[PDB]
Amino acid sequence: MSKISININGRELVVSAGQTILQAAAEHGIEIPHLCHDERIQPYGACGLCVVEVEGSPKLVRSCATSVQNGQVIRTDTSRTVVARKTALQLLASDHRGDCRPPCMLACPAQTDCQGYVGLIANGQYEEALKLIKDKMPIPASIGKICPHPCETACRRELVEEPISIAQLKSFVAEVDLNGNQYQPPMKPATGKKVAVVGAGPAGLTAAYFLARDGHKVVIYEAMPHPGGMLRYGIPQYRLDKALLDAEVALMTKMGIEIIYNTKIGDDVSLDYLHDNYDAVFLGIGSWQSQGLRCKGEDMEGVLGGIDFLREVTMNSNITLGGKVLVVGGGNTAMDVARTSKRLGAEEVTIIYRRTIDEMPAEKIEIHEAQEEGVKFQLLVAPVEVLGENGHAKALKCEIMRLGEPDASGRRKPEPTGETVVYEADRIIAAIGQKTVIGNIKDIATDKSGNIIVNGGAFTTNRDKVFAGGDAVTGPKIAIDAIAQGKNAAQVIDSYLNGCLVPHADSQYFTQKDITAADLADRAKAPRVSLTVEDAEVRNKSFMQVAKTFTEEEALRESKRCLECGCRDYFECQLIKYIQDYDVSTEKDSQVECHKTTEFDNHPFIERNPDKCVLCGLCVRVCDEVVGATAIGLVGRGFDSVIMPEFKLPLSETACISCGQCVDVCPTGACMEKQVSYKQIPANMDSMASVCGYCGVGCNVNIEYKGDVVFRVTPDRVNDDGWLCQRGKFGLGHANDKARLTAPVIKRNGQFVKVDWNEANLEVVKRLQAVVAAYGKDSIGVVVSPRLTNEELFLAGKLADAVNTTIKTSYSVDGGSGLGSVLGYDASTNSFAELDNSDFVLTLGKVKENHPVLDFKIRLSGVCSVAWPQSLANTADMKVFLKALLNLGVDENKVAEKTEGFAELKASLADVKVSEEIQALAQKYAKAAKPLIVIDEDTVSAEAVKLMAYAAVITGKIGAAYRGIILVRTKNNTQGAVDMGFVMPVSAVAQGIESGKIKALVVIGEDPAAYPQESALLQKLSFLVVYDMFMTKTATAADMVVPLVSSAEVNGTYTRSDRRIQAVRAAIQPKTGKATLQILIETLKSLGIKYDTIADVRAAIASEVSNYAGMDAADFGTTVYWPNNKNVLYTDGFATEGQKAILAAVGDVPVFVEKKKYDSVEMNFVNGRQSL
Amino acid sequence: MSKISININGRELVVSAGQTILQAAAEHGIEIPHLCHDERIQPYGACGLCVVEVEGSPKLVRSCATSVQNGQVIRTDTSRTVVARKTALQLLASDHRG
Ligand SMILES: Cc1cc2nc3c(=O)[nH]c(=O)nc-3n(C[C@H](O)[C@H](O)[C@H](O)COP(=O)(O)OP(=O)(O)OC[C@H]3O[C@@H](n4cnc5c(N)ncnc54)[C@H](O)[C@@H]3O)c2cc1C
Ligand code: SF4
Ligand code: SF4
Ligand code: SF4
Ligand code: SF4
Ligand code: SF4
Ligand code: SF4
Ligand code: FES
Ligand code: FES
């Protein structure tokens, strides 16, 4: 039928009927904007960004709410749709208030993400901080050491106290990585293009770095014996250590960049040579000519430039200074020359300038350091005449000025006074400024000041294939400007090499400019970290460093003080994405009203900001139509429309479940989830696909992390439905806990002593062997938790077998659900995927409260779901239900053939009367063609499960598709623990403890000792081992504790409630050193069973466990079910001894007794809920 | 369509409406014999090796010439289909020379 073939945007597509055009274009990779669209709920039609032009319809049709037909023509980028989307986005931006990026990053010329790496330092991830920094420059330590930090001026912490020392943190992290493992960023595969870079300054080095990172081959031609440019030959040693720069350039050279020294372009190698032999040329020559005194007698011997003097100082040449030195100028050159001459044996140095101290262009810190060192300032003075004798200059004549009106740049103009003064000197150094010289390079256009003329935004000179940047274009400026220009020019050159030149253009962000000190009166005040500066005694005579780098403690203390000004949703916000894509300006107005809120919702998990809302309605639609709590709703009309909780109450006082679906469907930053880490940040986080470790539903999750810290959890919308509950969303926060154990401890004299892993292994094996020797067989019980993977449970069973015991148990499993004795397998007879096609679902227990994602799925399915009444708590009512089902005409012959003991059961129910409600429920179950039963194991006794199985068996609604019993378990791998044999009841363990038969216990991940009776039972032991993550109540009373890792650091598999085996992948490396599987493998190697890796364990599981045959090549990335990869159990008969269902009479039953929680993680979550 | 989804041979499959059960089983890697079937032309119904057992229908249905519906249970290796295919292949082999 050429499956519904359509034509969109000129292309021909094959799609499926009943879809939406938006879904089809997403399937075939065509981008159509949308904000209020979600495929799992009904269309809303609010934004209007998804309008497309369909031939035959005079008006625009929304692609989110129209069905694909055969042979329709669609256009998504016509002028009408473009202007409609532009208008909608302009109207949306007229009410949106926020900071897309913090002021500190926007003030930096290179746009380095200061908030991101400051926050990453505050979380203790230094390598990730350097990975953030090195996306914008290749030399972070030097730049952090010398930058005048314009970013630090714009920091909003200035509104409270001194701002964050951003540059010192950058230098600290760069030095910590240089002393440790040097980072090399990944490179694209080689493209074969050749780029020649003239000059190895910051601009040239940055261009070469960012061009070699794109696969090209870069060669640097340098006119000096060492690389660095004015960072080497202009910055003195006591401010920037040259060894640091040499090490950084060596790191860059290790990437494959060839630097050719002693080669001057124009004098030694012509530029035509580079033009002919290379695919691109980038000129980063910089400004290297000293301005003269611009006065009479400036050519006299004894007057030298500041730049040449500094270069001669750097090359360790022979210089002459004499006693008295006069430096003319006020920039950074004058300061550096003055202090260098002070360190070079000059007894007195004088600085001469024309404006006030307050109008010096140098930094105030450098001026104060120079004043402390001993250089005297001579003020309000300009050059007049240089007086000398016999070709030697000894005096400088000058005029005295006076203060005048401020200029347009904010500095007071000097005015002459007519007073002359002469100054004695032995050397005069002119440090007025630098000027660009082009040298012998020809056919390059230059401006009136000597700078290279380039096309703005494209960095192209008059000559083709030749580019320029840095001080050659902007004149003398700070180093970060040169780095930014080099990076932008590298991007432009890379685009040019691909055949299409695109100019560099800035981006649009939302910014807020009304923040004042009165808005930050609730913040605490913390003093800034002072810098340790060497005393003025040693500074005046030596060239060593005057300041020391931050220590780790100081860096943490400084970094934990940021305010997090930026938006946390920036890297996933769609409003800003469409604003950048559709060229919409974010500048505000004054008359238009953006309503500013004074909201206060201190919910511990959910954050709502009404200012960033776009009224897409996804959050309220999800919370009503899926979750069903309806904790939020719309209030008002028009501009007063706002989404807010029930009766304007706080979200904590309403029916909210903190599931986080409203957070996960929001397209902007209005709804946000709270922070799992120590200090959360806006960042591009790595994602790992795993499954939830709390319930038997086993929802797939994506763990978003940065380094060794997990930051958030999101649903997996591709492989599952994409729903989560509070435990899945906010439950991985124990992986970052600082109270986790790190090394095993052995008790001696009543105190725990830290031991090595080998000593721990020896101690546990020898003590277990001693217990076995002293008390014989069956003296050891193995108590495990159902949270462990399949391989760890199999290895624990192997350890139980090899230690000569049969007591393997769990407090959570506590003997299983009782369905095993009737049908043969203690497992669900149907999968979750069959809840969609059933026509009746009967729920037993609190399925909604305990496993809520299953309730979401049942509600979205729309099938008729009837809950078992609460006023029927005893099983006499279930016996009445059985009698009512029997009276409705069941086939007795088939149930006589396929079951054992049907006649006795029928005789037992002979005198049972039937009530009306029971009759109605029985009728509803009887007329249903394909009825399912969903039983919550947390709130239903085993005998009720047996009676429900009897009801399903006698009606013949079991053993086939879309009919049976679905049983949801308490924990993630309760089914796996059942399938490995951990099905012994706990009462046997208690009795064996109190009868003296059991002398030792091995507890893996459980906390039985939190209750007084079990603690009293454990106190009568002889040797107890606890494997746990935390020093719980049980581990305190043990004789030996071994740490465990969390579910974010383990590789393995989990068996779902419906017998589905899902792979669990490790996001971060084990913080204790060894995984649980490794610990069990070494213990079994000590006991004499040899396993190497997880493949051997999986092969052993396949070859020893009966129903997991095929796990060796199972490919757990797809759907794997353990009974012969079948969704339905008992298709060819039950799995009992005689292939018949075993029906046995059950007695009178009291009200259900609520079960307890024994897994340490699941009680830690409950206790940590109360902390906020 | 929400999800046209079927259950064949115990497994749960997601399919597309308007197809044949033979095409769906080939899509999901389930082997059903066929000799006179081609997806690009009309069904013929000659060999009979494509018969499957569908719940609700008392007689065998040919998977090459039936449309896939929602929530149907299909068995392709029951004893009746096995003996039918064995008989058909025994009758075919009674005239084949080579
Ligand atoms: C006294 C002084 C104080 C300073 N203080 C600061 C400060 O506080 N903060 C700060 O951030 N920066 C400071 N700087 C540095 C300066 O502000 C910038 O770092 C400057 O922009 C360096 O970048 P650039 O691109 O110009 O590189 P350059 O340093 O100009 O690099 C040019 C390179 O190309 C080479 N070259 C030149 N001509 C040719 C040719 N024809 N062929 C081949 N190679 C050639 C040069 O030898 C050099 O290696 C200071 C500099 C000086 C001199
Ligand atoms: S380079 Fe300068 S402006 Fe940029 S982050 Fe570092 S200190 Fe701030
Ligand atoms: S407080 Fe932090 S986020 Fe805000 S401007 Fe300062 S460094 Fe940037
Ligand atoms: S929600 Fe989006 S548009 Fe609004 S401030 Fe955050 S990043 Fe910017
Ligand atoms: S967290 Fe869940 S229940 Fe609470 S408001 Fe959001 S969607 Fe509704
Ligand atoms: S809070 Fe978020 S999801 Fe809800 S209407 Fe506003 S933008 Fe949409
Ligand atoms: S329902 Fe259970 S398995 Fe699913 S996310 Fe919640 S706690 Fe995890
Ligand atoms: S109107 Fe369709 S995406 Fe909003
Ligand atoms: S394949 Fe021949 S009858 Fe269907």
Automatic annotation (TrEMBL), chain A:
Residues reported in the UniProt entry to bind [4Fe-4S] cluster 6: 692, 695, 699, 725
Chain positions recorded as NADPH binding sites: 291, 330, 332-333, 353-354, 434, 477
Chain residues that bind [4Fe-4S] cluster 2: 104, 155, 562, 565
Ranges where the 4Fe-4S Mo/W bis-MGD-type domain occurs: 685-739
Annotated [4Fe-4S] cluster 3 binding sites: 108, 147, 151
Its EC number(s): 1.2.1.2
Binding-site list for [4Fe-4S] cluster 4: 613, 616, 619, 666
Stored CDD domains: fer2
Domain 2Fe-2S ferredoxin-type intervals: 2-80
GO molecular function term, any single one: metal ion binding
Family annotation (InterPro entries): 2Fe-2S_ferredoxin-like_sf, 2Fe-2S_ferredoxin-type, 4Fe4S_Fe-S-bd, 4Fe4S_Fe_S_CS, DPD_II, FAD/NAD-bd_sf, FAD/NAD-binding_dom, Mopterin_OxRdtase
Keywords: 2Fe-2S, 4Fe-4S, FAD, Flavoprotein, Iron, Iron-sulfur, Metal-binding, Nucleotide-binding, Oxidoreductase, Repeat
Listed Gene3D superfamilies: 3.10.20.740, 3.30.70.20, 3.40.50.740, ADC-like domains, Dimethylsulfoxide Reductase, domain 2, FAD/NAD(P)-binding domain
SMART domains in the cross-refs: Molybdop_Fe4S4
PANTHER family to which the protein is assigned, alphabetical: GLUTAMATE SYNTHASE [NADPH] SMALL CHAIN (PTHR42783), GLUTAMATE SYNTHASE [NADPH] SMALL CHAIN-RELATED (PTHR42783:SF3)
Protein name: Formate dehydrogenase-O, major subunit
Naturally occurring in which organism (per UniProt): Sporomusa ovata
Lineage, opening ranks: Bacteria, Bacillati, Bacillota, Negativicutes, Selenomonadales
